[PDB]
Design a protein around this nucleic acid. Structure first.
Lengths: 52, 220, 105, 58, 159
RNA sequence: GGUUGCGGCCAUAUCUACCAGAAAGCACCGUUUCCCGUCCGAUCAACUGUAGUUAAGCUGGUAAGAGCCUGACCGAGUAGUGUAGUGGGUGACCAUACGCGAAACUCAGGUGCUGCAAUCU
RNA sequence: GAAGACAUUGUCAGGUGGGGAGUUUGGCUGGGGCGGCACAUCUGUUAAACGAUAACGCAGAUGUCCUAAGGGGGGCUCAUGGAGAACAGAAAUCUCCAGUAGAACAAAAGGGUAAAAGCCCCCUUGAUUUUGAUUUUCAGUGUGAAUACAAACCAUGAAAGUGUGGCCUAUCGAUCCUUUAGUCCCUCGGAAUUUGAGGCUAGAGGUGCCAGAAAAGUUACCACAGGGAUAACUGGCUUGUGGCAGUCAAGCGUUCAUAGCGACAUUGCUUUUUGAUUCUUCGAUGUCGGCUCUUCCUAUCAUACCGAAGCAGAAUUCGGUAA
RNA sequence: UUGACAUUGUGAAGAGACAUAGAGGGCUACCUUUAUAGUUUC
RNA sequence: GUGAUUUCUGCCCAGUGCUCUGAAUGUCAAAGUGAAGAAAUUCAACCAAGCGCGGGUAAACGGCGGGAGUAACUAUGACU
RNA sequence: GUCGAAUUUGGGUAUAGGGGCGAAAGACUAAUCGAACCAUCUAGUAGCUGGUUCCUGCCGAAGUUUCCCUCAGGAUAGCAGAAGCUCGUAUCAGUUUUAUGAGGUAAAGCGAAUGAUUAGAGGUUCCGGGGUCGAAAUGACCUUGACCUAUUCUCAAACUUUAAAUAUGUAAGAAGUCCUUGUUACUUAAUUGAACGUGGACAUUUGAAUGAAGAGCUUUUAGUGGGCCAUUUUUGGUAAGCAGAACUGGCGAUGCGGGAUGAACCGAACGUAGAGUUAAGGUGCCGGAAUACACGCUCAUCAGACACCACAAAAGGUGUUAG
RNA sequence: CCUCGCAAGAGGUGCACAAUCGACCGAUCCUGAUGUCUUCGGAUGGAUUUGAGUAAGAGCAUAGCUGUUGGGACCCGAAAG
RNA sequence: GGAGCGGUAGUUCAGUCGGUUAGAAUACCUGCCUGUCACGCAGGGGGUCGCGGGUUCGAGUCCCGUCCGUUCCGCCA
RNA sequence: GGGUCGUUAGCUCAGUUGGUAGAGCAGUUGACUUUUAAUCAAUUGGUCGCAGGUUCGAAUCCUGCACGACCCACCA
């Protein structure tokens, strides 16, 4: 009963992670979207983004 | 390559054309459905012979090709290329399917017996009936002894037995020989290119003048 | 989906029994709390050995939740519920559609 | 375990053994799911028309 | 997978029928339905509200209840071993009157008349419809119309 | 019989290209202060039947017109099909009996009828 | 002597803890697995002209989207082509003519739709409250979806009416538990008050294995019950594939279709290969080969007698009777 | 393994944290910064 | 763990472990502490070890790639 | 093979079961070891095998529906029995007739939409290019290229104007029809309608055929829920004694005559006997029965011989017979 | 069953049973009157609502076939724990 | 005999699965430097995002088919 | 043994998915140079080994054809 061993590098943190599971049972998938913001002056430690 | 046409002989399944559901087919082998003097005004060739199929069956494209070419070459080498105007009166629309298995030792990677049995396309073919007509010819009435031998030669390149009857009626059109002659000598015909057009007692009488000046006047 | 913050719907609260203005707010379950029998009953079963006594759910297939609008009738401040079909987006605020204007660049 | 999935075979032959007994209706059918208003009206009518026959004809 | 919706296998059932599209004609609506009258059920795709289920297309039954723009019809559906009595709620647009019942009623109307006529005659009617009785002994007439003799016809090609 | 308003059936009424229409009828057509509505008195609104027509609309007719319809021993008992056979056929299929029965084609015939109310030389 | 209220020990608590314990690992499945979902649904076709219907049959679709894409009214006519108008051209805006729908209707596919259900405007919450009746799939239970009504209170419209979601057919969930809404009602049972808790009616929080368990492997060390309902050897039916034989004859063969060949086609036969099948055997027919020994069959390698030859001889080829 | 309470006793200092007052800061949360009568955590 | 002798044991600390005399006020139980409340109780900060954040370690488990172009015949490609 | 030691062994002694010992094979642990043995818990559990004990009489099935971590099982409805109960020619009928509905299959159709497609003819362009005639032209003329018009050969499970056969719904009246008139909180402009009525008429052809070994009605419960073959319709599949459906019949569960033999084919269904009559098949002999009758066909140095059914093809032959 | 009818039939009464429309009792949702520690109180009247109801009782106990459930549960039969 | 993946300037590749824009490196080109070529300095162009069809305000990325290449399975007998 | 693919100019490479052949290298010729080489330009060489249909016509379509290149081949 075939397993699957993924190796996945984080989007945010960046560290390289691994997993192994039988492939039927679910690995719950996150949802992703781009905001396409426009970047004005970067103030202090934050950035400053302008939506249209 | 190509399993024998004994498989796809009889009309065992429903018809299955190249449609919005079934596409990426094999293309038909028989491309040229006419040959000889294809710009022949019907007043040239009065004879005709039909190659009539006695039996209800299917006909592969290949069979229709080999036959056509056979009849063709036997006509042109003998009578001369403008002695005849041989049509084929059937087109292969119906498709054949195959499952296709592995050959030398398929044991482990088998493609699973009769599972997913619906086949992909294979080759095109024409559905044919009892008394249905394969191949026209139309020639000069002296030339019969050539066409009769040509069709004879060509029928061997078909599944089953299909007979070679003798028609009347300036045979591509309808309408019998003596009747046709009467129409001609009466003036009830306009010689439209290749095939003949006919007069009527229906359409408005203005447009029957310019088309047909003859029929009604005392001159002809 | 978008819904507006106002809705002149029917109200049943002795004095009302007619169509009135409601303030349309999102339902949210709030705190669960101990002291409910069904919690105490659970905790007692849990304690000791055996360990996990009750079915912990896993196999989630739904992504969304069905939405509920807590309405408040302005007149008598007596409330009522209303449930929709499911959806991913939701805004109880305004921002109405524009008729047929051009795409944003 | 490829078992036979479905058929309707030898079913009609079961059906006709006792055999398609028809509804067996009654005069004065059941006013259930008949218009409420109409039912209410008919009620009062029956209440009245009983009285007429009861009180008068004696 | 398999599918069984409320309009399963109804491509050509609720087809509107050739060159008769749209605009629900107005006899339909003024046809007056009495309680306990027999009605045929031709569904009507050009109206969606109050539609019948596909099973009841062409099926016939009795009206039991009336309302604003509809009629309650009862039908005997066949299920398993028996007949079960249903209660539909069809909009008036899917219904017409039973012609056969009308015909019957007319026949009854004639029957009373026949009875009355018989009475002023002095009884004896014979009113039931007997089938096609095996037609009587008669004499024909040759006079001019002689037996035009035929034969069998020989096999001919003309093809 | 025509014509108007309101219809039922929904082309035997629709479409193409022409020609006729006296009476009234509609119809187009005159005008914008008010009610009214438009980018615009075109549209719809209102005001005049006065200032003018039958040019259109509408009606009717014509055409070996299209279309549509109606029937025909017109094709054709043609396909096709229910029933039966230890019927024929290597089979494909075909014939037989009891019955049922089409479409195209061809020919001929038709080109709105009609109800409610009002009005017209 | 060290050591010292610290350790040690007791009790609770968080971590660690295959070292050990228990348990585990879904179904369908032209055997099993791997693969799909045919496991909840919807469209058209298969479907055999009411319904009803199967296959791992065919071509597709669903878990969304929409305070308007809902509801009412008003106004208007769409795709496309023709002919025209500075920049303007295949197409940018305008105008007339034709335009039975060839468009547009949130999304699959099929229906349905023309002063419209289409597009533009106007005003709006009926996607509202109480509870039944009914139809569909059906056991005539549910769930979902829908239909006709009532009794309210609203919407819009001049009105007739039309509206209890999306023109129609899919778009979604039981118990227990939590939570909210309501009646601000009933119980805490020695009596009360106030907190708390428990009840009633209507929802939400989820079970896609979709009438709803909290669950990973491996066994060639294996075991038990069974199974010819089911694989792997033989046998059988079947022949695609394998092998073998024709018929036809375009071309080859200097010349010349068939001495010898023989394309494109085509009709077969065969059980010697492999497959396809699952009837027989799972309380077992000992499952490859080689050795050994018997016969049998020709579709003839050689040998006897023959005919054909692109046979001068020789050699060799084709064929016939022959096991 | 770690924490708490108990085992459980006698003392000494030296420091941090909570409440009032005085300063140097970006109407004002805090930021650094000294002092007071009490308690507490080391 | 490897397996006499001889000769040699290259690169990789990302993963997984193991480990650090390792910072912090991120995560943080019980008791204890503070606020509120008629009280049950509610809310809060404080917060052990670990977890996390970073550092080491491969005779620890282990691991240790493609694709183009190019030499004055053709090929091949030190070289890019 | 090894044989001076990591040697071999006696006795004593130690280690005890999910534990021991193990130069490691899951080996050894009293012929037991991938967890010893003895007893008990224990008659453990088993949707699975095996068996399940006398006669006769009557009635006599299912292998399908929906749900299930269901696919060898169970619930469920269906079939079958037994108990009856209420009546006593009811109202019904696997049917026809007369009448009237619905259907979108076989057929047909495409010079009809939808698409799929063979050919030329004529047009068209200023509104496509490649040429010749021309410095250019909304150019004089050829070659195509799409378009347009009238014709053409061909087609369709998921195309259709049209449209069968077979199957199919409903009516064929007493619970009816008419005449007078009562009811009401519904509805009407209206004692108009409405549904329900008292009263009066109309009945022995009471309103088609034929049939009714009674009609209706309730209870409860068994087994069952693995099917299979045949005609015709039909999907996958090259095809299959393959797989999957549709309408009847069978077989299971059933003997008998006939198919030599054979579960299903033909005939025909059985209480125990006699008689006579036949069905299907046969009638030289093996078998009971005409080496009957009559007209013809066949010569086979591979005859032929009666369905299911135990095969045969395309192609040939002045062998013969007839047209 | 009675009455009339020689009989055919008609008329009256119509148990059990079947259908139905009503009445009542309870819950639900409305209604709220006379009275009122002025928040108690509930009259009467309703309703496409619902109950395993009433509407002159049909029960109890023993016994017999049958079918169910728990039980060693028709008898034998594991691998195990 | 099937399942999944890839697809772009002359080459390696991001872009791309997020739809109303085609970026990097190298190579190429131009001028400059230099006695001349390299290196460098300062500028410049170049890809119908393999092909064909469809959905789409818009497809290069959305769906379907060829097309050429890379991977996975081939287990129990 | 069989299934698939390809065979192009002196040598190599596109070929267009059907109307006349493109590009590199090689060879010859000129330019350049004191000669050369390298470079720059110009030419020469092409029925794609043999048949059949043939789109008007085909190396390019298809099938045959001989020489290569791939992929497959008892069983327990």
């Amino acid at each position: 009963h075939a397993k699957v061993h993924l190796v996945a590098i984080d989007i945010f943190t960046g560290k390289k992670l691994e997993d192994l599971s039988p492939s039927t049972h679910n690995m719950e998938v996150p949802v992703v979207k781009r905001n396409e913001y426009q970047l004005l002056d970067i103030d202090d430690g934050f950035l400053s983004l302008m939506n249209m | 390559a190509r399993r024998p046409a004994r498989c796809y002989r009889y009309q065992k399944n429903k018809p299955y054309p190249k449609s919005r559901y079934n596409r990426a087919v094999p293309d038909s082998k028989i491309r040229i459905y006419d040959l000889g003097k294809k710009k022949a005004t019907v007043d040239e060739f009065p004879l005709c012979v039909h190659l009539v199929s006695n039996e209800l069956e299917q006909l592969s494209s290949e069979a229709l090709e080999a036959a056509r070419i056979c009849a063709n070459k036997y006509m042109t080498t003998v009578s001369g290329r403008d002695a005849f105007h041989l049509r084929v009166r059937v087109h292969p629309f119906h498709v054949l399917r195959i499952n296709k298995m592995l050959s030398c030792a398929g044991a482990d990677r088998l493609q699973q017996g009769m599972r997913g049995a619906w086949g992909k396309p294979h080759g095109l073919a024409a559905r044919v009936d009892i008394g249905q007509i394969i191949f026209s010819v139309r020639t000069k009435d002296s030339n019969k002894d050539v066409v009769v031998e040509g069709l004879r030669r060509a029928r061997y390149k078909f599944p089953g037995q299909q007979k070679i009857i003798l028609s009347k009626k300036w045979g591509f059109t309808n309408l019998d020989r003596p009747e046709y002659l009467k129409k001609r000598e009466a003036g009830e015909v306009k010689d439209d290119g290749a095939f003949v057009k006919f007069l009527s007692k229906k359409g408005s009488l203005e447009n029957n003048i310019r088309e047909f000046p003859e029929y009604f006047a005392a001159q002809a | 989906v978008n819904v507006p913050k106002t809705r002149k719907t029917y109200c049943k609260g002795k004095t009302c029994r007619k169509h009135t203005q409601h303030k349309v707010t999102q339902y949210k379950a709030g705190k669960a709390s101990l002291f409910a029998q069904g919690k105490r009953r659970y905790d007692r079963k849990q304690s000791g050995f055996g360990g996990q006594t009750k079915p912990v759910f896993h196999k989630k297939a739904k992504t969304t939740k069905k939405v509920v609008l807590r309405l408040e009738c302005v007149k008598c401040k007596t409330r009522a519920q209303l449930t929709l079909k499911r959806c991913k987006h939701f805004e109880l605020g305004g921002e109405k559609k524009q008729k047929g204007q051009a795409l944003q660049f | 375990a490829k078992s036979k999935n479905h058929t309707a075979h030898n079913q009609t032959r079961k059906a006709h053994r006792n055999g398609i007994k028809k509804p067996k209706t009654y005069k004065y059918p059941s006013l259930k799911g008949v218009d409420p208003k109409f039912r209410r009206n008919h009620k009062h009518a029956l209440h009245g028309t009983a009285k007429a026959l009861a009180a008068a004809k004696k | 997978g398999k599918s069984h919706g409320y309009r399963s296998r109804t491509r050509y059932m609720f087809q509107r029928d050739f060159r008769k599209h749209g605009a629900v004609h107005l006899s339909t609506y003024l046809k007056v339905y009495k309680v306990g009258d027999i009605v045929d059920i031709k569904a009507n795709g050009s109206i969606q509200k109050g539609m019948p289920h596909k099973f009841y297309q062409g099926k016939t039954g009795v009206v039991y209840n009336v309302t604003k723009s509809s009629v309650g019809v009862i039908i005997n559906k066949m299920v398993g071993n028996r007949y079960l009595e249903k209660r539909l709620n069809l909009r008036v647009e899917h219904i017409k009157h039973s012609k056969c019942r009308q015909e019957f009623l007319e026949r009854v109307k004639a029957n009373a008349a026949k009875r009355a006529e018989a009475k002023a005659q002095g009884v004896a009617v014979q009113l039931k419809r007997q089938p096609a009785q095996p037609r009587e002994s008669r004499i024909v007439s040759t006079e001019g119309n002689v037996p035009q003799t035929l034969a069998p016809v020989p096999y001919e090609t003309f093809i």
